[PDB]
Amino acid sequence: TAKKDENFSEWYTQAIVRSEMIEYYDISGCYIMRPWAFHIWEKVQRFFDDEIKKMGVENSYFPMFVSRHKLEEVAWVTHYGDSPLPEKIAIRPTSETIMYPAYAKWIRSHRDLPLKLNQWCSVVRWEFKQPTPFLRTREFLWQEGHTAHATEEEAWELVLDILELYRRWYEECLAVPVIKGEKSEGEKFAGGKKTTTVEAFIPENGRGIQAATSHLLGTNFAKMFEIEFEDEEGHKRLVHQTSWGCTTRSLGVMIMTHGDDKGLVIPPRVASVQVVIIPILFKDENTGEILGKCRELKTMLEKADIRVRIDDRSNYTPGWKYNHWEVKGVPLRLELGPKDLAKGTARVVRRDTGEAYQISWADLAPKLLELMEGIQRSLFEKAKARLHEGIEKISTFDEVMPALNRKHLVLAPWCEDPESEEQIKKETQKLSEIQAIEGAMKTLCIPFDQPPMPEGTKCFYTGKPAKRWTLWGRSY
Amino acid sequence: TAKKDENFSEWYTQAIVRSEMIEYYDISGCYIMRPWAFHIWEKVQRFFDDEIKKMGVENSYFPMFVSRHKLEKEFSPEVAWVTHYGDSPLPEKIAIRPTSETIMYPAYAKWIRSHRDLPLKLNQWCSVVRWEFKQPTPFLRTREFLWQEGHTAHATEEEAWELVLDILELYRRWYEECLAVPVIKGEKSEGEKFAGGKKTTTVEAFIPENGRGIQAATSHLLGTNFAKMFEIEFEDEEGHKRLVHQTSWGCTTRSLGVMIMTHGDDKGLVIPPRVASVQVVIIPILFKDENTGEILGKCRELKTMLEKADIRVRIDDRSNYTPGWKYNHWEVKGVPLRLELGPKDLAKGTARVVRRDTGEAYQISWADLAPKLLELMEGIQRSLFEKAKARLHEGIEKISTFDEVMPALNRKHLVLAPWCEDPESEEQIKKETQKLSEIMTGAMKTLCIPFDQPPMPEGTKCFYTGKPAKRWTLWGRSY
Numbered sequence A: 001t002a003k004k005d006e007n008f009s010e011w012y013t014q015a016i017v018r019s020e021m022i023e024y025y026d027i028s029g030c031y032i033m034r035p036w037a038f039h040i041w042e043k044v045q046r047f048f049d050d051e052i053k054k055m056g057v058e059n060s061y062f063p064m065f066v067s068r069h070k071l072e073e074v075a076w077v078t079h080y081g082d083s084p085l086p087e088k089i090a091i092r093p094t095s096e097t098i099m100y101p102a103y104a105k106w107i108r109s110h111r112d113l114p115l116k117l118n119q120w121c122s123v124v125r126w127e128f129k130q131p132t133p134f135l136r137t138r139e140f141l142w143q144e145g146h147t148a149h150a151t152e153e154e155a156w157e158l159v160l161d162i163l164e165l166y167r168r169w170y171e172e173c174l175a176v177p178v179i180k181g182e183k184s185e186g187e188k189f190a191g192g193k194k195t196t197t198v199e200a201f202i203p204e205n206g207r208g209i210q211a212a213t214s215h216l217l218g219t220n221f222a223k224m225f226e227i228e229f230e231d232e233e234g235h236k237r238l239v240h241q242t243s244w245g246c247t248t249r250s251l252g253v254m255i256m257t258h259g260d261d262k263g264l265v266i267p268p269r270v271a272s273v274q275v276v277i278i279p280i281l282f283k284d285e286n287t288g289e290i291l292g293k294c295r296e297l298k299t300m301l302e303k304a305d306i307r308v309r310i311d312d313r314s315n316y317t318p319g320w321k322y323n324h325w326e327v328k329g330v331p332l333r334l335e336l337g338p339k340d341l342a343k344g345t346a347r348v349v350r351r352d353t354g355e356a357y358q359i360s361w362a363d364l365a366p367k368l369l370e371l372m373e374g375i376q377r378s379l380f381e382k383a384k385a386r387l388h389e390g391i392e393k394i395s396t397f398d399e400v401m402p403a404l405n406r407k408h409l410v411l412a413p414w415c416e417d418p419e420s421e422e423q424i425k426k427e428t429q430k431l432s433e434i435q436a437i438e439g440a441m442k443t444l445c446i447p448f449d450q451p452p453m454p455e456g457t458k459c460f461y462t463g464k465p466a467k468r469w470t471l472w473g474r475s476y
Numbered sequence B: 001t002a003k004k005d006e007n008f009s010e011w012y013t014q015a016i017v018r019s020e021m022i023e024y025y026d027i028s029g030c031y032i033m034r035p036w037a038f039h040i041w042e043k044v045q046r047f048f049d050d051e052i053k054k055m056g057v058e059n060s061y062f063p064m065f066v067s068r069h070k071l072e073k074e075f076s077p078e079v080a081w082v083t084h085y086g087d088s089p090l091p092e093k094i095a096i097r098p099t100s101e102t103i104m105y106p107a108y109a110k111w112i113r114s115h116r117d118l119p120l121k122l123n124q125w126c127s128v129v130r131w132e133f134k135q136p137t138p139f140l141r142t143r144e145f146l147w148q149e150g151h152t153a154h155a156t157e158e159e160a161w162e163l164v165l166d167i168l169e170l171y172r173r174w175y176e177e178c179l180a181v182p183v184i185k186g187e188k189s190e191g192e193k194f195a196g197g198k199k200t201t202t203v204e205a206f207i208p209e210n211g212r213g214i215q216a217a218t219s220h221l222l223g224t225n226f227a228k229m230f231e232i233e234f235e236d237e238e239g240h241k242r243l244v245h246q247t248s249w250g251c252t253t254r255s256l257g258v259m260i261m262t263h264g265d266d267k268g269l270v271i272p273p274r275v276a277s278v279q280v281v282i283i284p285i286l287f288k289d290e291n292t293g294e295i296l297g298k299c300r301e302l303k304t305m306l307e308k309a310d311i312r313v314r315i316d317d318r319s320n321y322t323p324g325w326k327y328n329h330w331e332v333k334g335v336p337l338r339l340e341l342g343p344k345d346l347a348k349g350t351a352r353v354v355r356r357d358t359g360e361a362y363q364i365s366w367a368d369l370a371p372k373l374l375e376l377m378e379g380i381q382r383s384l385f386e387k388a389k390a391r392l393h394e395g396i397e398k399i400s401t402f403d404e405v406m407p408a409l410n411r412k413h414l415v416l417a418p419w420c421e422d423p424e425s426e427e428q429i430k431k432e433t434q435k436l437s438e439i440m441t442g443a444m445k446t447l448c449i450p451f452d453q454p455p456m457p458e459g460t461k462c463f464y465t466g467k468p469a470k471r472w473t474l475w476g477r478s479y
C-alpha cells in the first residue's frame, strides 16, 4: 500500500509484517523473527561461521549475566521470584567484561597465542529511543569475535581478514554493496586503537548505516585486564587484541536495499524458497493432474539443489498467491495451469523485473539456475549503481547542505582533527533546523580506497591542510 | 588427581577443567563453555537440526523477555526479574525466559486461522534461565543453559502424538547414536509430567558412580489444553472452529555432562568418534633434528589421505611442546585416536596408532591407514556404547516388594517395580525413602514408566500399596 519512495518508514513496517518476517511484540523494541527471516540469518551465519573456522576461530558460550562491579542503558536483574538478589546483575550489552578476565587466566606464555574465540548469541541494549525493526532494536542476535595475538601486525592482519569476510557476507550473500573504511577518532570504539567498518547507504532517506565492524584493540584491554604473556626470551608482554561483530541489522539492510513498491525482493542465495510453484486451480477441482505435475517438477528441481515450495493451499485464487509470494520476495514463481500441462511447459516470472519465460519442463532446472545467478548479480549491480549515485564528491562546505538535501552522502577532503567533526555536526544540525522551521551530519568512514589528493588541498571545513577523503552524511 | 570410582564429584570437576571444557565464573550457577566443549555441542546440534528440518520444522527466534501479565497467564520463585534500565525503574517488571510457552503461544493464536495453516512446526536454539538457589552441577544443573525448544500445532491428536514419538526417537539417537549414551524411553508419572500437558514422554539416563537417574530429554503431548488457554483455534474444511493439538520438546547441554560422566575414566575425557571434532591427532616425533622436514611432510600427506576418507584430522606440529606433552594433552582431552610418526616409522612406511578408550596400539602401513582407522573408530563408538549399556543393565534391579527398595538403593541401583500409578503413593514413597536414607537428597522418585514393559502376571500387587499393579515403573534417586 505505502510506496517505498513516498513514505519509506511506513513502507518498511508494512513490508516486514506482510512478508511474515517479523511479528511485533508487546515489549517495545523486541521482535519475533519468523522463519521467513530467520532462514536468511541461518544462511549468513553458516557462511560466516564456516569462514572463521577456516581461520582457526572456535565458538564458545559465555554467560549472559555480568556482575555490577565487573561491568564497571543496561538491563538490570534485581530479583528472582519475589526475593531480591544480594547484588544486581546486568544482561550483556557486549561481552568484553565477561570474556577478558578469562583470557587473562588462560594466557600465560607465548605458546598460548594466538587465542581466537567467537560466540553467537543475543545482546540487550535498552535505549529509550524509538526502535527500528532489524536496524536498531533493544534485543538483537549477533556474533562477537574476540582474539589475542603476540604482535600488532598479526592482530591487524586478522582485523582485515574479518572485515573482508563482512564484505562477502553483505555483497556475496545479501547482494548489498558496502564501503570499507576506518572510523574517525570520535566515532571509533573508545578503548580500541583503530576501528574498521563496512558502511551501507539507504537512498530513500539518504542515510548511511554501519553494516559490520572490526576493531584493532591494541594493548589497552590487555593492560586493563592484565592479559600478559611471557615471550620466547622470558619477558612479560601485553597481548594485542581484536574484536569484531555483525548483527541481524544485515537483514534490515538487505530488505531496504532490494525492496520495491510491491514488497520484498530476496536474493536467491539467501531466500528460504527460491522457486514457488503455483498451481492454477480453483476451489474444489483437484483431479490430481496439475498437482501431480507440480510434485514431479518439485522433485526434479530439488535434485538441482533448488529450494522449492508448492503453494497448494485450497480456497485462494492464483492471483492471490502471486501477490502473496511477491510480497514475501520469492525470486522466482513457476505457474502451472491446464494450458501449460497441455503444451509441456511452465511459465516462470522473476520477481526483480517481472519478466516472464516459457520454459520446457526438461529445460527447467538449468534455466532456473541461470536465472537465479542473473537475479543475484542484477540485484547487486543495481544497488551498486545506486550507491555510486548517492555519493557526491565535494571540496568546500558550501556544498554540504545542498548535497544533504538531495539525500546524498558527501566525500570531502578532511583535516581529520576531532574537534572539527563535532563542529561540523553542530553546524549542520543548526543549518538543518533553520531550514526545517520554514539532522546532524557526521563521518561515516574514511574509505580504504582513497582518490588522489592534489598537493595543498584544503580541508573542506577548516581550511587547513587536508589529510584524507572522508565520507560524511546523515546516519542511523 | 581423583579416581572416578573413589571421589566422583572431584573426578568430574578435574575432568572438565583439565580437558578445557569449562571455566568458572563469579556468578554462581553459571559457567563458561570453552571451545573444546562447544565442539561437541555443535556436533549434536547439527545432527538434531538436520533431522528436524527433514520433518518440516523451521527455526525462529522469539524474545528473551516476557511481560508479567503474559508470564502469569494462569515455579514463580525461579524466574529472574528485570526491574530497571540504567537507574530508571521499568513501569512494570519483565522476566527472562525460563521456557517460551507464554511468549510463543499468543503468536500461535494469531497466526493459526485455517486448517491451511497446519501443521505449524517451529524450533529455536537459545538459552534460558532458571534461578534456583541450590548448588549447581556443571552441565547437569545450571542457572543458565543452552537448549533447543520445539513447539508444534496440529489439526488432530493422532498427528501430534506421532510427532511426539518421532522427536523422542531423535533424542534417543542424540544420546545413543551420537554420544554413545544408553537411554530408556518412557512416560512420566502424573506427578512428574509437565503440568498442563496431557502426556510427557522422556528418555532417561543413569549415572552408576552415584546411582542417580537423570532425565536426558523430553517430548510432551500437550493436547488441546494450551489451545484452550491461549485460544489457538482453526476453521476446519466445513467452517467449524476446532482447537489445535500441540507438542513441545527440548534438550540441553546437560547431554554433554552425561556423555562426560558415562565415558570418562581416570585419564580424563573420552569422546565418542561421532562427536569428536578431532578424531585423529597426528603427533610428529621431533627429537635432535632427526629427519624433521621429511617427518612433517609425511604427516601432511597422511592428513590429506585421511581427509579424503572424511576422517577429521589435526596435526599437532606445535614446536613449543614435546611429543610426550602432546600425548598427555590429547589423551586428557579425549581424542579417540593418536597417530605417532617418527624416523623409525618413516623408515618402515608405517605409523603407530593408539586408541583412547582401551590404550591398545597398532602398527599400520600407510596404505592401510584410512580403512583401518575407519574400522577402529566404529569399534570405539560401538564399544563405548555397549560397555555403558551393560553398566545400565547392571544398575537396575527388578523387585516386587517395598522391602527390597532400600537395599537396592544402597547398592546405588535403580529399581523396576510393579506400581498402581496412584499419584499420592509417589509422594508417600518419596517421603518414606528420604526418611530411611537419613537414618543431595536421598528421596526415591519415579524416573519413567518404560515403553518396553515386561510381562505383568495377573494379580501382581503394587510394590508399595498392595493394590493391583498397573505397570512396571523405573524408580531411583535422581538429579
Ligand SMILES: Cc1cc(N2CC[C@@](C#N)(C3(C)CC3)C2=O)cc(C(=O)NCc2cc(F)cc(-c3cnn(C)c3)c2)n1
Pocket (backbone or CB within 6 Å): A029, A125, A126, A127, A128, A129, A130, A131, A132, A134, A135, A136, A137, A138, A140, A210, A211, A212, A213, A245, A246, A247, A248, A249, A476
Ligand atoms: C540491531 C542493532 C544493531 C546495532 N549496531 C550498532 C553497530 C553494529 C554494527 N555494524 C554492531 C553492534 C555490530 C557492531 C550494529 O549492528 C545497534 C543497535 C542498537 O543501538 N540498539 C539499541 C537501540 C534500541 C532502540 F529501541 C532504539 C535505538 C536508537 C534510536 N535512535 N538511535 C540513535 C538509537 C537503539 N541495534
Ligand SMILES: Cc1cc(N2CC[C@@](C#N)(C3(C)CC3)C2=O)cc(C(=O)NCc2cc(F)cc(-c3cnn(C)c3)c2)n1
Pocket (backbone or CB within 6 Å): B028, B029, B130, B131, B132, B134, B135, B136, B137, B139, B140, B141, B142, B143, B144, B145, B215, B216, B217, B218, B250, B251, B252, B253, B254, B479
Ligand atoms: C542444565 C539444566 C538442565 C535441566 N533440565 C531439566 C529437564 C531437561 C531435560 N531432560 C530439559 C530442560 C530439556 C527438558 C533438562 O536438561 C534443568 C536444569 C535446572 O534445573 N537448572 C536450575 C538449577 C540451577 C542450579 F544451580 C541448581 C539446581 C538444582 C540443584 N539441586 N536441584 C534439585 C536443582 C537447579 N539445568
Ligand SMILES: O=C(C[C@H]1NCCC[C@@H]1O)Cn1cnc2cc(Br)c(Cl)cc2c1=O
Pocket (backbone or CB within 6 Å): A073, A074, A093, A094, A095, A096, A125, A126, A143, A144, A145, A189, A213, A243, A244, A245, A246
Ligand atoms: O560493543 C562494543 C564493542 C565491540 N564488542 C565486541 C563485538 C563488536 C563490538 O563493536 C561497543 N559497545 C557498544 N555499546 C555498548 C553499550 C553498553 Br549499555 C555498554 Cl555497557 C557497552 C557498550 C560497548 O562496549
Ligand SMILES: O=C(C[C@H]1NCCC[C@@H]1O)Cn1cnc2cc(Br)c(Cl)cc2c1=O
Pocket (backbone or CB within 6 Å): B075, B076, B077, B078, B079, B098, B099, B100, B101, B130, B131, B148, B149, B150, B194, B218, B248, B249, B250, B251
Ligand atoms: O519448560 C517446561 C516445558 C517445556 N517447554 C518447552 C521445551 C521443553 C520443556 O520441557 C516446563 N517448565 C520447567 N521449568 C519452569 C520453570 C519456571 Br521459573 C517457569 Cl515459570 C516455568 C517452567 C516450565 O514451564
Ligand SMILES: [Br-]
Pocket (backbone or CB within 6 Å): A043, A044, A047, A173, A269, A270
Ligand atoms: Br549464501
Ligand SMILES: [Br-]
Pocket (backbone or CB within 6 Å): none
Ligand atoms: Br557496537
Ligand SMILES: [Br-]
Pocket (backbone or CB within 6 Å): A281, A285, A286, A287, A288, A290
Ligand atoms: Br482440475
Ligand SMILES: [Br-]
Pocket (backbone or CB within 6 Å): B008, B009, B210
Ligand atoms: Br556425586
Ligand SMILES: [Br-]
Pocket (backbone or CB within 6 Å): B045, B049, B125
Ligand atoms: Br543451527
Ligand SMILES: [Br-]
Pocket (backbone or CB within 6 Å): none
Ligand atoms: Br523442563
Ligand SMILES: [F-]
Pocket (backbone or CB within 6 Å): A236, A237, A238
Ligand atoms: F608489551
Ligand SMILES: [F-]
Pocket (backbone or CB within 6 Å): B042, B043, B046
Ligand atoms: F558439526
Ligand SMILES: [F-]
Pocket (backbone or CB within 6 Å): B313, B314, B315, B316
Ligand atoms: F592440522
